[PDB]
Design an enzyme around this catalytic site. Structure first.
Site, PDB file in Angstrom:
ATOM      1  N   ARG A  84       0.703  -1.258  -0.077  1.00  0.00           N
ATOM      2  CA  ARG A  84       0.055   0.169  -0.039  1.00  0.00           C
ATOM      3  C   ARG A  84       1.000   1.260   0.068  1.00  0.00           C
ATOM      4  NH1 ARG A  84      -1.723   1.161   4.371  1.00  0.00           N
ATOM      5  NH2 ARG A  84      -1.061  -0.920   5.674  1.00  0.00           N
ATOM      6  N   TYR A 232      -1.720  -4.889  -6.208  1.00  0.00           N
ATOM      7  CA  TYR A 232      -1.097  -5.512  -4.916  1.00  0.00           C
ATOM      8  C   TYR A 232      -2.045  -5.296  -3.771  1.00  0.00           C
ATOM      9  CZ  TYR A 232       2.291  -7.567  -1.769  1.00  0.00           C
ATOM     10  OH  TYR A 232       3.070  -8.395  -1.045  1.00  0.00           O
ATOM     11  N   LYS A 241      -9.269  -3.166   2.924  1.00  0.00           N
ATOM     12  CA  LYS A 241      -9.063  -1.781   3.464  1.00  0.00           C
ATOM     13  C   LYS A 241      -9.857  -0.921   2.812  1.00  0.00           C
ATOM     14  CE  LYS A 241      -5.678  -3.715   6.039  1.00  0.00           C
ATOM     15  NZ  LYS A 241      -6.119  -3.770   7.611  1.00  0.00           N
ATOM     16  N   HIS A 261     -10.038  -1.911  13.125  1.00  0.00           N
ATOM     17  CA  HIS A 261      -8.964  -2.776  12.591  1.00  0.00           C
ATOM     18  C   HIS A 261      -8.653  -3.650  13.799  1.00  0.00           C
ATOM     19  CE1 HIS A 261      -4.556  -2.570  11.033  1.00  0.00           C
ATOM     20  NE2 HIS A 261      -5.364  -3.634  10.407  1.00  0.00           N
ATOM     21  N   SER A 283       0.243  -2.799  12.449  1.00  0.00           N
ATOM     22  CA  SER A 283       0.369  -4.025  11.508  1.00  0.00           C
ATOM     23  C   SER A 283       2.097  -4.680  11.499  1.00  0.00           C
ATOM     24  CB  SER A 283       0.093  -3.515   9.904  1.00  0.00           C
ATOM     25  OG  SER A 283       0.764  -2.385   9.636  1.00  0.00           O
ATOM     26  N   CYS A 285       2.736  -5.966  15.014  1.00  0.00           N
ATOM     27  CA  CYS A 285       3.008  -6.204  16.873  1.00  0.00           C
ATOM     28  C   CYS A 285       2.252  -7.354  17.196  1.00  0.00           C
ATOM     29  CB  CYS A 285       1.945  -4.855  17.216  1.00  0.00           C
ATOM     30  SG  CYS A 285       3.033  -3.463  16.912  1.00  0.00           S
ATOM     31  N   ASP A 308      -8.206  -9.693  11.243  1.00  0.00           N
ATOM     32  CA  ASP A 308      -7.508  -8.062  10.926  1.00  0.00           C
ATOM     33  C   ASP A 308      -8.716  -7.095  11.069  1.00  0.00           C
ATOM     34  OD1 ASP A 308      -6.020  -6.338   9.369  1.00  0.00           O
ATOM     35  OD2 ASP A 308      -7.091  -6.461   7.489  1.00  0.00           O
ATOM     36  N   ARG A 402       3.277 -12.067   1.352  1.00  0.00           N
ATOM     37  CA  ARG A 402       2.024 -12.514   2.182  1.00  0.00           C
ATOM     38  C   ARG A 402       1.697 -13.921   1.763  1.00  0.00           C
ATOM     39  NH1 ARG A 402      -0.990  -8.225   4.917  1.00  0.00           N
ATOM     40  NH2 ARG A 402       0.313  -6.426   4.496  1.00  0.00           N
TER      41      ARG A 402
HETATM   42  O1  LIG Z   1      -1.725  -3.474   6.281  1.00  0.00           O
HETATM   43  C1  LIG Z   1      -2.626  -4.049   7.066  1.00  0.00           C
HETATM   44  O2  LIG Z   1      -2.783  -3.563   8.043  1.00  0.00           O
HETATM   45  C2  LIG Z   1      -2.921  -5.522   6.268  1.00  0.00           C
HETATM   46  O3  LIG Z   1      -2.383  -5.758   5.255  1.00  0.00           O
HETATM   47  O4  LIG Z   1      -3.673  -6.057   7.078  1.00  0.00           O
HETATM   48 MN   LIG Z   2      -4.463  -4.926   8.897  1.00  0.00          MN
END
Ligand SMILES: O=C([O-])C(=O)[O-]
Ligand SMILES: [Mn+2]
Ligand SMILES: [Mn+2]
Ligand code: NA
Length: 610
Positions: A84, A232, A241, A261, A283, A285, A308, A402
């Protein structure tokens, strides 16, 4: 029509424009007129569609089959398209202030607004003819269980078969969604890789993208998401998102609910009593780690509802009901081991798409922190399609690489993970990476204090602010979002969840972590569990409630440094509060709720008195 240039029926290679709901056909045909696809493929969501699309991408060199596993796949992207890009992520509203508070310093860290006028120009510069020579895929998808009153439907148009495949996993998609939708409202999702044929630029790594023109736009008042140039993840899988956080948070504001989130987990104690908890972390932790935790305490069970995003709404009884709007896990791969996350490893063994990870000579996957020895002779191809050794400077997998796996495959997936009514949340957990000053766990003093704790969240990337773990994701003005959270306390019947804050990552005076973490975090969850149950296992401090002396179960952990781990220093917290003060004044200013400023003043005063 007077001619032959508006009716796209002859271009339909699966499905029928005549079968679509009216508004779906207009969305499809109008964008086909603009983007000029060679073909229109209305997705049915079948296994047959899926397998054939996978084999097609394989023959084209777009993906590779991973032979070590059952029906697993590997995509390696153009290195320009790996994540992102928040600087190219925008929300369009009539006034800037509806999207973001107006910062006193001039640069907002709480979102990025674009005028209607500027977006129109950007749109016209990008989309006309953008799908020339390609198939436009039509993805009807539901976010949430198909029959859930909390679920929302979208249609995503895309020229990327990779998106189709990934969306099948991450959402409920296909013919049944169209049947369920009928003539109802849906979120409009438009995506293009931005490489019309014939290609004007070189195709790198068989991964179509347009980095220079990448733009991920959200038009909440038009209920439209428009994304160009990136194939992506969160840029292209529009349900995750864009929809389930940005558009949804605005919708939630309007409608009286929350789009957050947060992971959702169910925890059962050794007496059979079960609770559901939600947790928002930045993202990096240990969010997926906590969501499918393997607890170390005998008799405790943890089950995963989601890892998520959470959609949460108070029912008529006042319970905060949550659903996972997603259908799979789009998890960060590096750091995933049988140690850190054994249940994740089990989930991703089959029917899983990997992106930008390393490949072993026997057809398996590899990444940093996989902590799994390879047989001698077994070699590694990096995510850059080059031979790799464990001693080389650069990593074998991109840090944002991923796995994309079905949720139903998680060995501890919660039996209620698809229940239409959702699961009752009894606690909400905030947390980040703080090497110093912030205790292992504390409990908010009130709902209002709890909202403040969320608003004040900071985490080491440099320690930066990330309120509610939503910094890259607010659909609207963060101050208004805080007001929204606060309003929950003013509805009769509402049973407000207890709020906690955790820090797994506190260190001593030489860089050593104070808490073993992973499965041992169950010991913290046990404390939360009891606090929800109303046990007096807490001690009052200036920052909130902490565990009493000996309240925490630390059996089997050896000599735990309790005094350092739960230590609260005036000097540190004086600094902390001033910093929060300066941040909120700058970034939120006129839109800061009175209650939040009050909690700030209260915390400052409690610190001043120690
Ligand atoms: O960036 C993020 O938080 C994800 O991809 O879950
Ligand atoms: Mn996330
Ligand atoms: Mn951990
Ligand atoms: Na590739």
């Amino acid at each position: 029509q007077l001619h032959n240039g508006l009716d796209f029926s002859a271009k339909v290679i699966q499905g029928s424009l005549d079968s679509l709901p009216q508004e779906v056909r207009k969305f499809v045909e109008g964008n086909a007129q603009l983007c000029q696809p060679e073909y229109i493929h209305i997705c049915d969501g079948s296994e047959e569609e899926y397998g054939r699309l996978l084999a097609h991408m394989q023959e084209e060199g777009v993906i590779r089959k991973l032979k070590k596993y059952d029906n697993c796949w590997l995509a390696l992207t153009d290195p320009r398209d790996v994540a992102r890009i928040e600087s190219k992520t925008v929300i369009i509203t009539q006034e800037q202030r509806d999207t973001v508070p107006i910062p006193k310093s001039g640069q907002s860290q709480l979102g990025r607004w674009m005028s209607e006028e500027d977006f129109e120009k950007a749109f016209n510069a990008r989309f006309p003819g953008c799908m020339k020579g390609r198939t436009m895929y039509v993805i009807p998808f539901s976010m949430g269980p198909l029959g859930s009153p909390l679920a929302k439907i979208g249609i995503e148009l895309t020229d990327s078969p990779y998106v189709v495949a990934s969306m099948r996993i991450m959402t409920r998609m296909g013919t049944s969604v169209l049947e369920a939708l009928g003539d109802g409202e849906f979120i409009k999702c438009l995506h293009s890789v931005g490489c019309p044929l014939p290609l004007k630029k070189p195709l790198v790594n068989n991964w179509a993208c347009n980095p220079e023109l990448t733009l991920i736009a959200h038009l909440p008042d038009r209920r439209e998401i428009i994304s160009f140039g990136s194939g992506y993840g969160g840029n292209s899988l529009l349900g995750k998102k864009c929809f389930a956080l940005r558009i949804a948070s605005r919708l939630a504001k309007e409608e009286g609910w929350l789009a957050e989130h947060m992971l959702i987990l169910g925890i059962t104690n050794p007496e059979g009593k079960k609770k559901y908890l939600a947790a928002a972390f930045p993202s990096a932790c240990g969010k997926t780690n906590l969501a499918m935790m393997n607890p170390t305490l005998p008799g405790w069970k943890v089950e995963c509802v989601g890892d998520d995003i959470a959609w949460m709404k108070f029912d008529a009884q006042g319970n905060l009901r949550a659903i996972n709007p997603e259908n799979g896990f789009f998890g960060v791969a590096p750091g995933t081991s049988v140690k850190t996350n054994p249940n994740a490893i089990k989930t991703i063994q089959k029917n899983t798409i990997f992106t930008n990870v390393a490949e072993t000579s026997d057809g398996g996957v590899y990444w940093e922190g996989i902590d799994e020895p390879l047989a001698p002779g077994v070699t590694i191809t990096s995510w850059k399609n080059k031979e790799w050794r464990p001693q080389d400077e650069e990593p074998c997998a991109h840090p944002n690489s991923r796995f994309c796996t079905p949720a139903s495959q998680c060995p501890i997936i919660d039996p209620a993970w698809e229940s239409p009514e959702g699961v009752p949340i009894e606690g909400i957990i905030f947390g980040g990476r703080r090497p110093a000053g912030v205790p292992l766990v504390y409990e908010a003093l009130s709902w209002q204090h709890g909202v403040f704790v969320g608003a004040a969240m900071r985490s080491e990337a440099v320690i930066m602010h990330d309120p509610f773990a939503m910094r890259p994701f607010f659909g609207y003005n963060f101050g208004k979002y805080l007001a929204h959270w606060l309003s929950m306390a003013h509805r009769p019947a509402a049973k407000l969840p207890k709020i906690f804050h955790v820090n797994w990552f506190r260190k001593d005076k030489n860089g050593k972590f104070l808490w073993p973490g992973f499965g041992e975090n169950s010991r913290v969850l046990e404390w939360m569990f009891g606090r929800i149950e109303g046990e007096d296992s807490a001690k009052l401090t200036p920052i909130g409630y902490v565990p009493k002396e000996d309240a925490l179960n630390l059996k089997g952990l050896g000599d735990v440094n309790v005094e350092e781990l739960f230590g609260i220093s005036k000097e540190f917290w004086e600094k902390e509060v001033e910093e929060i003060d300066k941040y909120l004044e700058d970034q939120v200013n006129a839109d800061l709720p009175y209650e939040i400023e009050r909690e700030l003043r209260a915390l400052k005063q409690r610190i001043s008195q120690m």
